[PDB]
From a paper:
PCNA is a ring-shaped homotrimeric complex that encircles DNA to act as a sliding clamp, ensuring processivity of DNA polymerases. PCNA levels on DNA are regulated by loading and unloading. After completion of each Okazaki fragment, the Elg1 RFC-like complex (Elg1-RLC), which comprises the Elg1 subunit associated with the Rfc2–5 subunits, functions to unload PCNA from the lagging strand.
We then constructed strains expressing each PCNA mutant as the only copy of the POL30 gene, expressed from its endogenous locus, and found two PCNA mutants PCNA-D17K and PCNA-D21K that accumulate on DNA even with Elg1 present. Elg1 can physically interact with PCNA-D17K and actually shows enhanced interaction with PCNA-D21K, suggesting that accumulation of those PCNA mutants on DNA is not due to a loss of interaction with the Elg1-RLC unloader. These retention-prone mutants increase the mutation rate even in the presence of Elg1 (columns 3 and 5), suggesting that PCNA accumulation on DNA alone and/or the D17K and D21K mutations themselves can increase the mutation rate. The structures (at 2.80- and 2.85-Å resolution for PCNA-D21K and PCNA-D17K, respectively) reveal that the mutations alter the inner pore of the PCNA ring. In both cases, the PCNA pore becomes more electropositive due to the swap of a negative charge to a positive charge. For D17K, lysine 17 is positioned within the major groove of DNA, where the electrostatic interaction with DNA is also enhanced. The D17K mutation on the other hand disrupts a salt bridge network within the PCNA pore, resulting in partial unraveling of helix 1, and a conformational change of an adjacent loop (residues 20 through 25). Because this conformational change occurs on the primary interaction face of PCNA, the D17K variant could potentially perturb binding of PCNA partner proteins. To avoid this complication, we focused our further analyses primarily on the D21K variant.
Residue numbers in the entry:
A (entry chain A), B (entry chain A), C (entry chain A): 1 to 256
Amino acid sequence: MLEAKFEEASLFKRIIKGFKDCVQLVNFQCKEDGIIAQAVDDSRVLLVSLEIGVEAFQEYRCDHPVTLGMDLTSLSKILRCGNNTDTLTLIADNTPDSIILLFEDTKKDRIAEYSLKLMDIDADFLKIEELQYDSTLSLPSSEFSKIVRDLSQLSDSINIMITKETIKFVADGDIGSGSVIIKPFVDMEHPETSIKLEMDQPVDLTFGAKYLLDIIKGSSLSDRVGIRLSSEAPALFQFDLKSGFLQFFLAPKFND
Amino acid sequence: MLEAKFEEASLFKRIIKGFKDCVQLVNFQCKEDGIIAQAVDDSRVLLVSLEIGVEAFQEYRCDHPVTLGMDLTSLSKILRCGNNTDTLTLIADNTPDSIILLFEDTKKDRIAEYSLKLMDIDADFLKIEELQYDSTLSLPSSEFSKIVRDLSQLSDSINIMITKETIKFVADGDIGSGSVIIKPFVDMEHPETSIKLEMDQPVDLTFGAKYLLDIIKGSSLSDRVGIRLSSEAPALFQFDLKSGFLQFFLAPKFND
Amino acid sequence: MLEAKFEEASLFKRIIKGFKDCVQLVNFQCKEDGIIAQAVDDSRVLLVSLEIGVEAFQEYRCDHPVTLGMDLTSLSKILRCGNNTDTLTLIADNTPDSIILLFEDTKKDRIAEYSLKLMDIDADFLKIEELQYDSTLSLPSSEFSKIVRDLSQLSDSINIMITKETIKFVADGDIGSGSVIIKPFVDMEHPETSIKLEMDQPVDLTFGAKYLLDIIKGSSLSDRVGIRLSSEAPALFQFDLKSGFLQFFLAPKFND
């Protein structure tokens, strides 16, 4: 059996929002220590990887590992079905016919129990994170979201440039162009709005704006975003859950 | 002559919202004791029936009965034309060339008088309400609306099931499935949120979700909804106005 | 060189909203005393004319006159790129390769500098305002916007009628019809909501509702709108900036 109770369905709803642009069929491996999931998109330039730990739940029990594969169109539909504050419970049995999602409320009324038929997906799991990235940075999710959104209207390609104490976002398209230059600093009032940067090697990479627009949906889950860039491997954008994470690996646009 | 003044145009606007999915041509019989109207839809599975009494108005005068038939596309358009708090007045003369809608405001400015050309509709009025329905229930309009809306995303058919002290809404479609089980109780704090049920015979009927989605638009007009279900006749969903009602008769889906 | 700093980008964003329905290519003449611009639409029935004076800015410097022509689709896109309270600065050099738009914020972070490639437009400037219009009136932008919007749903033509102390807006189409009659008065509490009218000659003109809908977008820029109507020339609708204006000249519909 398996029973995992989120204190608030909002968290799972936002996490699943994080997958709008992958293969709508996604495997969720549920183990003794929590849930992991990963999904690639069609073009195979973007990988989404989620880990939710035991303590991110309100309650959690997984007697034996169980892989449940779900259609994210349909799970996303079923996840519109309650107030963000409802306690959401995933329930399954040893070999799962189907996953159960049970919503509960502040009031003692209205049991809302949904089911989702599980699919059979072949699990080709990707371990593509690097040890040392060329540069690491972190900044408020809100700020990163605004930068991406704004620059997205000028061209279909956003270019990240890292030099000593200088982070430069640039969109250069037919109509016009735009640049946003931020620099590291500590804001002692709220260490939230702080901007951190470690640069082992300067970097200059270009990304499809469609995919950055997808990636910034994770702002709903964390105050800060972490960006690891290197010229060799795909770039990593990470939003941290209370004991967990949602990660977006994105391959830079090719030059030719 | 005929002159009927709603204290607030909001009420008539919401009532007319209740007709979005009928023959856009609708007869309004205005009599000494108020207004009645009824409209069937194309497929002829849903009937909408409205009664507004003298006391639901701010003022009312109908010297002689007058039938005024209107295009609800066009009346709906003309009903976007003022603040919800404007005093709205319907005006007509003995044999009506046209209906007049006169908006007035808190401020003494801005007379806004619209007209609508009347059509000739043949009045085939339906008296299809039963004496004894198999089961009767009542519950908050908000709750019924949420249940219908949620379950509507899983299949195109919602199934109502009534057993002793148990009301069960169920949608079972291709992607997944959903169930919502409520039970009767008295909430003394707010007798609003109370859920009432009388069951003379258990019932099990299925309804097109398109039509339940249409029917729940009446939540704007009442705190509670009444549902009379029987296996013989069409089901009745009723929202009560201050001395009036808006009723939706809906024929269950056929089994075959 | 040229450097013009709006205290708040909101103002320029709303001004440019005022041009949604012109030739998307628009000349901006920048002179010692401020900025002027004008744009005709395709059908050539509507002219939009803007003047912004030195004092409407937070800072202003124009060493030599410079004509910069811009695509308003693209400038409108680039103008979504900041908070309404950002200080927006237009920057150019003697013969302009490109215009620069520099956003600055309350916080010392995030330099956001965009560029727009300039086009070559031939400047056929129109001086079509009359000395004496047949009638002049002024009324709250909100009220004019509501009247236009409401009446726009009944027909594609709105008809203005001016008689002694009587202003009458009328839409008369297939579905129904609507009339709105306002009269001059002084409201001493707020001289804003006052309605002023000088009538040298009664007037009766008809206007495409598409174009009135376009014109009312200027409500964002002023509390009041001024309307000069005459039977000879195109009608003038004027919204006043703090030392400036946005004007819409609109030719009446032809009778035939």
